[PDB]
Design a protein around this nucleic acid. Structure first.
Ligand SMILES: [K+]
Ligand SMILES: [K+]
Ligand SMILES: [K+]
Ligand SMILES: [K+]
Ligand SMILES: [K+]
Ligand SMILES: [K+]
Ligand SMILES: [K+]
Ligand SMILES: [Mg+2]
Ligand SMILES: [Mg+2]
Ligand SMILES: [Mg+2]
Ligand SMILES: [Mg+2]
Ligand SMILES: [Mg+2]
Ligand SMILES: [Mg+2]
Ligand SMILES: [Mg+2]
Ligand SMILES: [Mg+2]
Ligand SMILES: [Mg+2]
Ligand SMILES: [Mg+2]
Ligand SMILES: [Mg+2]
Ligand SMILES: [Mg+2]
Ligand SMILES: [Mg+2]
Ligand SMILES: [Mg+2]
Ligand SMILES: [Mg+2]
Ligand SMILES: [Mg+2]
Ligand SMILES: [Mg+2]
Ligand SMILES: [Mg+2]
Ligand SMILES: [Mg+2]
Ligand SMILES: [Mg+2]
Ligand SMILES: [Mg+2]
Ligand SMILES: [Mg+2]
Ligand SMILES: [Mg+2]
Ligand SMILES: [Mg+2]
Ligand SMILES: [Mg+2]
Ligand SMILES: [Mg+2]
Ligand SMILES: [Mg+2]
Ligand SMILES: [Mg+2]
Ligand SMILES: [Mg+2]
Ligand SMILES: [Mg+2]
Ligand SMILES: [Mg+2]
Ligand SMILES: [Mg+2]
Ligand SMILES: [Mg+2]
Ligand SMILES: [Mg+2]
Ligand SMILES: [Mg+2]
Ligand SMILES: [Mg+2]
Ligand SMILES: [Mg+2]
Ligand SMILES: [Zn+2]
Lengths: 144, 55, 49, 102, 118, 110, 155
RNA sequence: GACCGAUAGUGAACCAGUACCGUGAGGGAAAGGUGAAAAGCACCCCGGAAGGGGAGUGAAAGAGAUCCUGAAACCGUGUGCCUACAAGUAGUCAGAGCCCGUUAACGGGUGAUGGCGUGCCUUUUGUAGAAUGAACCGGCGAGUUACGAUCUCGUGCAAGGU
RNA sequence: UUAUCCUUGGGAGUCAGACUGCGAGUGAUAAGAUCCGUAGUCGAAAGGGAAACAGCCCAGACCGCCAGCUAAGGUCCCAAAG
RNA sequence: GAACAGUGGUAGGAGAGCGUUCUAAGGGCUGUGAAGCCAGACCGGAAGGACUGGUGGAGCGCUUAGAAGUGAGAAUGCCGG
């Protein structure tokens, strides 16, 4: 019947800049996940990517509550026996702040092919400066 | 050890991707103009390197 | 009567039940005999009394 | 101009001159039919019903009484010898919208 | 009289294989697996004709929420306000306005806001 | 205009003939003859005779020019199998399929 | 059945160990060339209705011929020569287009012979009248002498 | 003949109690169809031949002996749509794009992507089952008949019925 | 208030049960144990929830709908809704 | 025909039907092309049934009733491929 469906021809992506400084990792990430998916758009269509591009600046200034800086471990496994490796959140934020944000958001996106495509619209930067001036990105202020 | 499942037509055809012949390493014979294998005596006329062999 | 318009008395003839002719009939597979035991076997069942 | 009308147990956005398929009405091809439950009128002048727009109607001509393309409803329960096949062709009334009277 | 099997068997099986057109490999070719897949397709299609109604309502709700939040309402508050104002325009229609006639959607949303602010 | 030749029930396995056919399909008849002449396979002389038979037909029956011919179709179909039995260990026999081929070539003007 | 098919005495292979299905005879019913399970066997299909039902049935079909105006009572039927051409002419004259059952009191050799070769005409004595012959011929040509003889028995 | 019609009917429609198996007693197959008529393809061409392509014959040769029909599995040739970042009981529902155009229908093919989704059967308290069965396709393959008993229904006649 | 109940006759199948809650035994007040009693569900029940999960919670699928209201369970994102 | 109610289901009971071969009686079709086979986007609540085209080259439907070697996906089923 009549429910409109977005498609490649119809879709128009904005670029947005989110400042991570002073934001809680998960609270910021949940909002950004929703923007990359396109959940803020009335033309949201579940089988295409209706989301916007997001730049995150000041990734190393992201905050964590509690004792998470010391106590949140990022595990990975190399698929070699005994190959569990770990970094603390402090080690992550100091030396891999872009990965830290990318992991949080990646875990909040849908998991298959379109989800993987949705992640490609994210761009995370350690500093205050991003290289995407030519895309003319607007500041997006995170809601509650 | 025996096949646990039969192989589908598709998997059989994928495996045979590389089961092919190549075109011969062939070149025109300068003597008689028939194709010959490069670096071999031309069978048609018996020439190699502008000399008759089968004399 | 006419041999081309024969009609039995209503209720005089029924169709026989044919068991073991598919699931739709309600007597497919086990042909109404249930599962296993002496009563389901060919020639089966104990003698009268 | 467009209207949201309640027909069937459903609602449909209609413009004038639009062919629409709806649940079967008690009508015949050729007959003008009237939708009395207009929930909303759009376009230039916007009437919002509460729930209905008072005095609004949409007239339509019945083009066709039909049945939709067949659905074979097949269902089974594995290992229990339970199969059930059933055809279905849902009746519809095809109507062309004549006039939206806001 | 003897009844040979005859033609009924292949006629029946051919019909199943015709319904299996476009299935992968042996599933469009061999009766026993085509038959299983056609059966399974029936159970799925029955289930999915029910799910379809759940899925579209989910989609409409998502779009109404997006449009609502552009007017400073959550979907929940909007739907509460529309119910108080007496508006019975359904989710399929609200979501259609949200995409196709957003000014109309905003009027309905403004009607809802009015009732909530009371 | 097309000319066809067929070799029916040639004693060679179809899979083996198709290796060689794949070399010549779509080639100009001059090139194809060369390829077959310098391809060392059992199928090569058989396929060469069919190809030459098709060219002869093209010239003799249809007055086509052999210089402007191309192989337009080329395929191998399964002929009937000669079933044989190889004695194996422990008194068991195992089947041997002496397969045959139907080899078709169609030539046509370019 | 599996007992009557030629051969089939020995067990085709040992019960266990070969990997084959167990089999008892090469003429078991699942084998090509095997015995038939429950096929046809020679039998009669005859049964008797009560004599009064038989009386009722023949009266019913005769009384149904009178309703349908398909009885033709003849003063007598008598051919000079046993000649088919004459019988065919007689049936023309009586407007007997299709099938007809001719009933005579006793055996009438000439009538029998004359009608013998005409398709769908059957001759019968009054004794030989029967439900299927009456119902399977459009017209019933019966002599007055035969009517009397039929009445004698059935009444 | 409300018997069979080539896996049927005899084991045997055919050079069958043959071939084949077994020391022997003994066991015991497979295998029907050119055409109305051989008119069974002169002649030419490629090829050692086989086999083809023409030409003829014929109503038909895509009826040419492996000769009525000629299903499926299985094997190929061509190509409209899709496919080399993807995790797949293979479908289903949603769905663009591209290609088509029908028993004209709220059409057909293909299917990026999204949601859901552990074959069938048997046997089990319970099986996606790491239980059982099936390589696939085809054919064949299992509550019958006789005589008795009993109940329901039907019909005829009825203190009688046969 | 509800529509069952009984009799006679024809035809069966079943006699491996499972878990859950509650009341007992056996056991070690072990067992997804065993054996009774009692209610439920599964068996023979699909749908929603409990990640997945016969037996738990909610609830009984004649079909169709791109309508609506709710149950258990939920409403930051995966994932509908604070 | 209205109203009201109902329509998950294994073993299993009950009912209504579909299709197959043969027979009888009507009635028909077919060399201006039967059955069979292939294809299709048609029709019926299911079993199933048509229509059109192709192949095929001589037989076959329909109606009513009768009679059954009457329906296969499984048997480590048998035979063939
Ligand atoms: K029973
Ligand atoms: K035999
Ligand atoms: K899918
Ligand atoms: K086992
Ligand atoms: K208990
Ligand atoms: K035909
Ligand atoms: K089998
Ligand atoms: Mg998911
Ligand atoms: Mg019964
Ligand atoms: Mg049952
Ligand atoms: Mg079964
Ligand atoms: Mg059993
Ligand atoms: Mg038991
Ligand atoms: Mg029992
Ligand atoms: Mg069969
Ligand atoms: Mg030896
Ligand atoms: Mg014996
Ligand atoms: Mg053993
Ligand atoms: Mg036999
Ligand atoms: Mg027959
Ligand atoms: Mg035959
Ligand atoms: Mg035989
Ligand atoms: Mg000997
Ligand atoms: Mg032909
Ligand atoms: Mg003939
Ligand atoms: Mg043939
Ligand atoms: Mg990647
Ligand atoms: Mg790719
Ligand atoms: Mg997984
Ligand atoms: Mg067990
Ligand atoms: Mg077992
Ligand atoms: Mg197995
Ligand atoms: Mg118990
Ligand atoms: Mg226990
Ligand atoms: Mg059970
Ligand atoms: Mg119950
Ligand atoms: Mg359940
Ligand atoms: Mg779940
Ligand atoms: Mg189960
Ligand atoms: Mg949400
Ligand atoms: Mg129900
Ligand atoms: Mg026939
Ligand atoms: Mg049978
Ligand atoms: Mg089979
Ligand atoms: Zn040379």
């Amino acid at each position: 019947r009549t429910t409109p469906m977005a498609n490649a021809s119809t879709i128009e992506r904005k670029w947005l800049v989110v400042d991570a400084a002073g934001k809680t990792l998960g609270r910021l990430s949940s909002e950004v996940a929703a923007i990359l998916r396109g959940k803020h758009k009335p033309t949201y269509t579940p089988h295409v990517d209706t989301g916007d591009h997001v730049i995150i600046i000041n990734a190393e200034k992201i905050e964590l509550t509690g004792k998470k800086l010391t106590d949140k471990i990022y595990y990975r496994h190399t698929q070699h026996p005994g190959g569990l490796k770990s970094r603390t959140a402090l080690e992550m934020r100091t030396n891999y702040p872009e990965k830290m944000l990318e992991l949080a958001i990646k875990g909040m996106l849908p998991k298959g092919s379109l989800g993987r495509q949705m992640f490609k619209k994210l761009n995370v930067y350690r500093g205050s400066e991003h290289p995407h001036e030519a895309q003319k990105p607007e500041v997006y202020e995170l809601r509650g | 050890a025996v096949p646990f499942r039969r192989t589908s037509k598709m998997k059989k055809r994928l495996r045979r991707t590389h089961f092919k012949l190549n075109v011969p390493g062939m070149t025109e014979c300068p003597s008689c103009g028939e194709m010959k294998l490069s670096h071999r005596v031309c069978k048609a006329c018996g020439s190699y390197n502008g000399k008759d062999i089968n004399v | 009567m006419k041999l081309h318009e024969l009609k039995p008395s209503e209720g005089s003839r029924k169709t026989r039940n044919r068991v073991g002719r598919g699931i739709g009939s309600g007597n497919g597979k086990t042909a109404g005999k249930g599962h296993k035991g002496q009563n389901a076997r060919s020639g089966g069942g104990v003698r009268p009394g | 101009m467009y209207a949201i009308i309640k027909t069937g147990g459903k609602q449909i956005k209609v413009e004038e001159g639009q062919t629409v398929y709806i649940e079967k009405l008690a009508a015949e091809a050729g007959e003008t039919v009237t939708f009395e439950d207009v929930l909303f009128v759009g376009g230039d002048n916007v009437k919002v019903g509460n729930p209905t727009v008072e005095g609004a109607t949409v007239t339509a001509k019945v083009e066709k009484q039909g049945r939709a393309k067949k659905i074979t409803v097949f269902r089974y329960k594995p290992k229990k010898n339970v199969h059930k096949k059933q055809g279905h062709r849902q009746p519809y009334t095809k109507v062309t919208i004549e006039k939206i009277n806001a | 009289p003897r009844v040979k099997g005859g033609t009924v068997t292949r006629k029946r099986r051919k019909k199943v294989l015709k319904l299996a057109k476009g299935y992968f490999g042996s599933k469009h070719t061999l009766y026993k697996v085509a038959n299983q897949q056609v059966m399974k397709s029936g159970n799925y299609a029955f289930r999915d004709r029910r799910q379809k109604k759940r899925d579209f309502r989910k989609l409409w709700i998502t779009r109404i929420n997006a449009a609502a939040r552009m007017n400073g309402l959550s979907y929940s508050r909007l739907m509460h306000g529309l119910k108080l104002s007496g508006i019975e325009v359904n989710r399929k229609m609200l979501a259609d306005l949200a995409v196709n006639d957003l000014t109309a959607f905003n009027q309905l949303a403004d009607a809802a806001k009015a009732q909530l602010n009371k | 205009m097309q000319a066809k030749a067929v070799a029916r029930t040639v004693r060679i396995a179809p899979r083996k003939a198709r290796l060689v056919m794949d070399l010549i399909r779509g080639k100009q008849v001059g090139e194809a003859v060369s390829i077959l002449n310098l391809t060392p396979r059992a199928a090569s002389p058989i396929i060469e005779k069919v190809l030459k038979s098709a060219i002869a037909n093209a010239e003799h029956n249809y007055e086509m020019d052999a210089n402007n011919l191309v192989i337009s179709q080329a395929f191998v179909d399964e002929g009937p199998t000669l079933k044989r039995f190889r004695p194996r260990a422990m008194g068991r026999a195992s089947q041997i399929n002496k397969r045959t081929s139907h080899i078709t070539i169609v030539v046509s003007e370019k | 059945n599996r007992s009557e098919v030629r051969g089939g005495g020995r067990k085709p292979w040992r019960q266990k160990g070969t990997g084959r299905a167990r089999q008892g005879s090469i003429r078991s019913p699942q084998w090509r060339g095997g015995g038939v399970v429950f096929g046809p066997t020679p039998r009669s299909y005859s049964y008797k209705l009560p004599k009064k039902v038989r009386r009722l049935a023949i009266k019913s079909v005769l009384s149904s011929k009178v309703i349908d105006n398909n009885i033709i009572v003849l003063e007598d039927l008598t051919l000079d020569t046993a000649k088919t051409k004459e019988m065919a002419a007689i049936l023309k004259g009586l407007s007997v287009e299709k099938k007809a059952l001719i009933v005579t009191a006793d055996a009438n050799e000439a009538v029998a012979l004359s009608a013998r070769n005409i398709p769908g005409v059957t001759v019968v004595e009054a004794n030989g009248i029967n439900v299927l012959d009456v119902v399977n011929h459009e017209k019933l040509l019966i002599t007055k002498a035969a009517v009397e003889k039929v009445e004698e028995v059935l009444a």
